[PDB]
Design a protein around this ligand. Structure first.
Ligand code: HEM
Ligand code: ASC
Ligand code: NA
Length: 250
């Protein structure tokens, strides 16, 4: 909603289609889908709607932004993608990273998130400190996703389901381990695990737990745990919105 996507050339569109295929094979073989989803999300999640700064405009590869503590480990993702990006010189880095995030979800068995090309790479990274803090709660989540990014409460809960793939690392954030028993499979298990309590060997952040005690978030957790199709629909909507923050008159 509210989007007017730009025209790109036929050659640009051909490159998007071929890069999507190459990214599927690469991400599947390297087992790095979670890290790639995290890269796309940390690129997009810096958007501030009031100032129209930050967002998915390719700045995450700049050494200054990779140095943000919230981005520990993402230098690995940038390096992994560099040889592939060099095969598609016509594409913006902004588009390439967002495409990699869409592909990460698809190859782990998640929904097909719509993708529209045309993001232009911006020169300057946003200031540090916009991404969410795992030790904080619902008020903080609404400040970051709502007041800054302009996303809804439904989007907060569905996007938190990104933790259905991957793990934390004690050398990156300090937290450690996977949220689910199948960290390379995208399904509604994040919500099932959240509801059943703490199982040994699985992770829950304070920010995950905040979803269970908030009056608006909890019904959504319950719905997604009961209905994976509802989760997939809402996730696809929210990821598309995230990947387009500030893009295509926003
Ligand atoms: C809701 C607020 C959120 C907080 C506080 C948060 C925090 C974290 C933290 C602390 C980690 C572990 C980093 C590490 O040690 O390796 C992590 C990993 C991850 N996050 Fe989130 N995150 C949030 C939202 C999201 C969103 C919106 C997405 C994407 C839709 C996402 C996708 C991921 C993925 C896939 C990983 C695993 C990375 C890997 O396996 O290397 N997160 N997050
Ligand atoms: O998702 C990830 O992928 C890589 C590695 O496990 C496979 O390349 C990594 O360090 C992650 O956190
Ligand atoms: Na999983």
């Amino acid at each position: 909603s509210g989007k007017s996507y730009p025209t790109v050339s036929a050659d640009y569109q051909k490159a998007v289609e071929k890069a999507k295929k190459k990214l599927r094979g690469f991400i599947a073989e390297k087992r790095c889908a979670p890290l790639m989803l995290r890269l796309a999300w940390h690129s997009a999640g810096t958007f501030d709607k009031g100032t129209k700064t930050g967002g998915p405009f390719g700045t995450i590869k700049h050494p200054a932004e990779l140095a943000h503590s919230a981005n520990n480990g993402l230098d690995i993702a940038v390096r992994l993608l560099e040889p592939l990006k060099a095969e598609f010189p016509i594409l913006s880095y902004a588009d390439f990273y967002q495409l990699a995030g869409v592909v990460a979800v698809e190859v782990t068995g998640g929904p097909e998130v719509p993708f529209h090309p045309g993001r232009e790479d911006k020169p300057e990274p946003p200031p540090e400190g916009r991404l969410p803090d795992a030790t904080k709660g619902s008020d903080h989540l609404r400040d970051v996703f709502g007041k800054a990014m302009g996303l809804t409460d439904q989007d907060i809960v569905a996007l938190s389901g990104g933790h259905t793939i991957g793990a934390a690392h004690k050398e990156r954030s300090g937290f450690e381990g996977p949220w689910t028993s199948n960290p390379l499979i995208f399904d509604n298990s994040y919500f099932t695990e959240l509801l059943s309590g703490e199982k040994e060997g699985l992770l829950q952040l304070p920010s995950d737990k905040a979803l269970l005690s908030d009056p608006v978030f909890r019904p959504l957790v319950d719905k997604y745990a009961a209905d994976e199709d509802a989760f997939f629909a809402d996730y696809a909507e929210a990821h598309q919105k995230l990947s387009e923050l500030g893009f295509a008159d926003a």
